[PDB]
Symmetry: C4
Subunit: 330 residues, 4 copies
């Protein structure tokens, strides 16, 4: 084996991240303005815009969830707060008209009660929210939820970064599989644990397990530009979950921060010291970006442009687009 | 598939940019001073110097087109202005003696009238000027022009970055095919849409469709050094179109700008906010470089040196030269 | 041969370093808190924590060796001092309770006497401490020690970076093989001699020679993050030796240094001018990191997290984990 | 073809530079202090140290040639000065005892007279000094010299970067072949002409043509560290020619330059504007490094260390050593 040892499987793959690829233009009669950006969030739920906001306490509370739904996407309410408060945020969103909303739950002792209070509050999507879903406890929680409240509520499981893990979630009954172990902008799992999977390869592998079962893949983490959304969807994802790209918006939690004459907002991992109070996330800042509506417009604008270049009339068509791999120089 | 999924065609190629390759020296009895730098701009038009200036409003108006033609190249007048003004710039150039000149047209509602006014003004080359020529409207415009005024005017179509797109333009009747989707120095399509094709690979692919039909390829975008011109031509292109490399010259539109004691000129994408007034270009600055004549001398000087090292007596010979691929370290 | 010449073996392999790979998550029912971090230092000695401190005079004297042993690892006392002083440091450590301790010896004229004084002082591990163990003198020293005092003392040999060198040490009787030629943070062998071997590949190759004989591999040098420890062990190493990561701790030799309002400690190669008084190491500084106990907690915390993600209940299981290779972009 | 087009030979090879490889350690009983560093400069001339100084006017005049010869290497006197002055510098060197000296000649109108005046002055080596030796005029000059004065004077030809070019020089009668097109530290040929060949691959290819005919290869350009000398020789070169590494020494031409409290000397390409008065070199500065004797000691010290690690008792043995290819991360 050229990289060492005698086992070809020790280094199992070459992992590509968003920056490693570009979408190839293709024959097109699709105008960006006329592309259909709708896509499946879950088996049953289709969004007008294929974007959801991260379940993080510097990204999504009621104000963000409301704005996301109004923009045609959805918010996933974070779970770093008491059960009654999270359920009350669900109520606040559903009060704002017929708006879709999701909410994160863990697999700990209080997770089941949290999920039931969220169901009672009228949540549409429960996101079983972990860093490693390939685990009997996580799979059992997914299955239990789907068998208990699965007629009225869609159940997302995550996160995974391998084909086998995605397959396990599908088998457990997941209505969507969320992909991303290590790619988050505020993630230090890569350096702390030495664990991760570049996101283009992780999406390609997850989709290989999920698409044949009609289960949509949510690409979660590592998206830095509007172009990354197009790349994630072309790799086979049905939606993208965004943290950093939405953390600078007016609707995110947190105050404005002024440093060196420029405006920022705090953005922190849910595995950072501050969020937990061995951290696997940092506490950082992102530039202030203004109203969510405007950020989403620009992001969807880039997606539309990609659909124009690739001749993709729908997201389903975009999922069939081809990449070129680029070098460091490119 | 080593990079993920089960489809070998999902990642269709490995795309090289100019910085990924160098020209290999070869047996040579050609002195740089004695090389023949002439090359086909179109099927019928041969330039003394294989360089054309970008159809941009911070690069080519009448003054630049005149200087380019006098230097042995050609200018393509930009189309970000009323039809009567563009046609009047064509008249200004043709007034300066028997000078070649080209002009850009779109495929919008006013494009046909623009093209006819340009024909009436005595233009030699019409450039159907788009970001994505693999499109029925663009192909139809190319064909219509070629069938209507194609006896007296040469019709360039662009831009493309794939073999199939180049093939479609050839079939539509293009007299030259312009290659470049995403490589421009002021381009943000790569980040905004996630779309592009590294330019060496894009030229190799386009030439594979165009050369067998005797249709010249114009390499447009991404050329940063005189050496890139040699590389583009060796990859099979017949001419190169330059924006950034010519934007700093006295003959380009725009005022001198002084920042931190150094001189610059404004250089902006035609897809930037300022040019359009979701942008796919930026508004920037390039160092002031002095008279066009001197910049072209240096650029052709580098090309001549390359022809010396590779034993290329003509451009046609240079198109047969070989590359070495280099690593990040090199 | 694509990279030149006609000999495919001239460039013998593609060497990967820690930054070239990530651990892939795998099915897991292992909680980080419950993983077993114990591992073989030598054929006979098992540590609670798979970490040893470098035999360097800015890393390990008695204070560090005591703290390392108490944390469940071990210190290797450096040999840049008189024999009586080194032996006295061994005595100081053994005085602090039943604590494991190792000590470095060379292969020079005074090396045998040094090793016997260390044996008399009650050392548990002798580390034949060289930059190139594939050498008859080093192999002979290893063998002599193992045949003379090998019933009561374990003999480590190093350093190596190839399969053949590791094999030679095994055959000489080594109880453990230490791997690392050129990767140290303060190493300049790579630039001075042009010699080295990227550490993931070097570990994979050494383990291929050592594991089939039940000889543990110590990964020495190049570990910058807690995640690198997990990577080294997954590549097949049984323990990791750390210099830079432990040099900033309270227990390391040397004074606190204040520059630009921040705290540092001196950290220098044993091949630096200052340590020797043609240098193959530099004299540098590392940030002050506080008590050893806390640094080890964080490092083991990262290892535990990796064992969680990879479903490794023990180190032996972690040694079977798989990598993904990443690009420069990732 | 994965990188574009249908011609596998268009991109002829993957070129490696010094930074792309490291020497693998090997079984060794060679102490650095006892290695034999002698090597063939030409078919007939063997140096004690395998290093020659560049024929540049900021590197080698009489003072440098004398110091190089005394250190066991050789200087090649530059040719950017009148014939009588260059010949007089040869006389100055031969006056300093039995010291080897070389001198550059071109292939221009005054080149033959220059070569004869140098022969009359007692030169030992004539270096036919060009940027592209694969040319009938250069090959003819080499042959003419070898047939005219080749009994008493050794004739070096260069520079080349391909197997075919090296083969042509061998056939012309070269006593040594000098390799390097584009790698020099002050070289801009790569950017100006887009022409070059990474030096490890260029040496491997040249050696493949030269070694079977017993013609030594001189590695010229791109050597930044003492370790690069070992790498060049292991790739098959017999000696290395150094410019930048020797330009900072007391014996180089030029004054001391003080900028920002640090000492420098001027170092400029022979293709820079200043040396010629379309430039293919820059005018720069290198740190002042003190006496040549000390720089050579450090450089040979690194070479010796490499011979120690690779078990090379002689240079001839070092030429058989193996590389590992490294990634950007390494
Ligand atoms: C098999 O048993 C296990 C397996 C794994 C863990 C780790 C774990 O649960 N956490 C808590 C969540 N974070 S995170 O906030 O930083 C995070 C949040 C969402 C997405 C992530 C994606 N990649 C990295 C971190 C992510 C990481 C550490 C575990 O802990 C008990 C037990
Ligand atoms: C299939 O239907 C489509 C397909 C594509 C588009 C995009 C489009 O027409 N534009 C306007 C031109 N720009 S540009 O100025 O930035 C530009 C100018 C020239 C060369 C370029 C090369 N690569 C990138 C940008 C370039 C990009 C956006 C579209 O819009 C209606 C409709
Ligand atoms: C075959 O004969 C030989 C072979 C090799 C050597 C070199 C040698 O012994 N030394 C002394 C030790 N250093 S070091 O302190 O920098 C060092 C310390 C530990 C680990 C290292 C890992 N990689 C690099 C340097 C390392 C390098 C130079 C030699 O010298 C007489 C004789
Ligand atoms: C086939 O006919 C030819 C072919 C080639 C040339 C170029 C040429 O002779 N020169 C003059 C020498 N320089 S240089 O000083 O910069 C130089 C000096 C030594 C080593 C070099 C290695 N790589 C780059 C530059 C180098 C480059 C330009 C030519 O000119 C008439 C005619
Ligand atoms: O602390 C953390 N460490 C690692 N990943 C995190 C952490 N907090 C949230 N995440 C994940 O990172 C995603 C946001 O990634 P981003 O959009 O690149 O900033 C989130 O949706 C989570 O999946
Ligand atoms: O706004 C823009 N975005 C992307 N490409 C542009 C834009 N404006 C012009 N171009 C293209 O970029 C080329 C100039 O590239 P440059 O020489 O690298 O600066 C032009 O000839 C166009 O093909
Ligand atoms: O001077 C030196 N040059 C090269 N390697 C050294 C030197 N001193 C110690 N080492 C090795 O570098 C290791 C520490 O590497 P680090 O943890 O990356 O700093 C040590 O355990 C030695 O194996
Ligand atoms: O102006 C120049 N342009 C390109 N190469 C040059 C020039 N002048 C000298 N050289 C070559 O560069 C070598 C020195 O390379 P260096 O040791 O990397 O600085 C010289 O021996 C020449 O072969």
């Amino acid at each position: 084996v050229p990289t060492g040892g005698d086992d070809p499987t020790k280094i199992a793959m070459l992992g590509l991240t968003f920056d490693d690829v570009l979408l190839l233009p293709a024959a097109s009669d699709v105008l960006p303005a006329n592309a259909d950006t709708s896509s499946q969030l879950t088996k049953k739920i289709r969004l007008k815009v294929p974007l959801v906001s991260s379940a993080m306490d510097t990204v999504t509370e009621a104000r963000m969830a409301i704005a996301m739904a109004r923009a045609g996407g959805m918010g996933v309410l974070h779970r770093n707060l008491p059960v009654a408060e999270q359920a009350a945020q669900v109520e606040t969103v559903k009060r704002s008209g017929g708006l879709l909303v999701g909410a994160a739950v863990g697999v700990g002792d209080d997770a089941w009660e949290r999920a039931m209070a969220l169901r009672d509050a009228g949540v549409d999507v429960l996101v079983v929210d972990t860093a490693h879903a390939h685990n009997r406890k996580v799979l059992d929680m997914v299955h239990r939820l789907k068998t208990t409240v699965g007629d009225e509520i869609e159940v997302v499981g995550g996160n995974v970064a391998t084909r086998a893990a995605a397959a396990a979630l599908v088998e457990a009954g997941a209505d969507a599989v969320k992909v991303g172990v290590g790619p988050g902008s505020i993630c230090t799992t890569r350096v702390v644990a030495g664990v991760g999977a570049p996101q283009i390869t992780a999406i390609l592998e997850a989709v290989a397990a999920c698409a044949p079962h009609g289960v949509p893949v949510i690409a979660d983490g590592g998206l830095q530009y509007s172009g990354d959304i197009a790349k994630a969807l072309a790799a086979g994802a049905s939606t993208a979950m965004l943290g950093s790209l939405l953390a600078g918006t007016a609707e995110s939690p947190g105050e404005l921060i002024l440093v060196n004459g420029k405006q920022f907002k705090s953005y922190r991992g849910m595995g950072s010291l501050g969020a937990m109070q061995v951290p696997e996330g940092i506490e950082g800042r992102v530039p202030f970006r203004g109203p969510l509506s405007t950020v989403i417009h620009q992001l969807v604008g880039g997606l539309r442009a990609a659909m124009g270049y690739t001749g993709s009339a729908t997201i389903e068509e975009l999922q069939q687009a081809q990449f070129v791999q680029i070098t460091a120089a490119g």
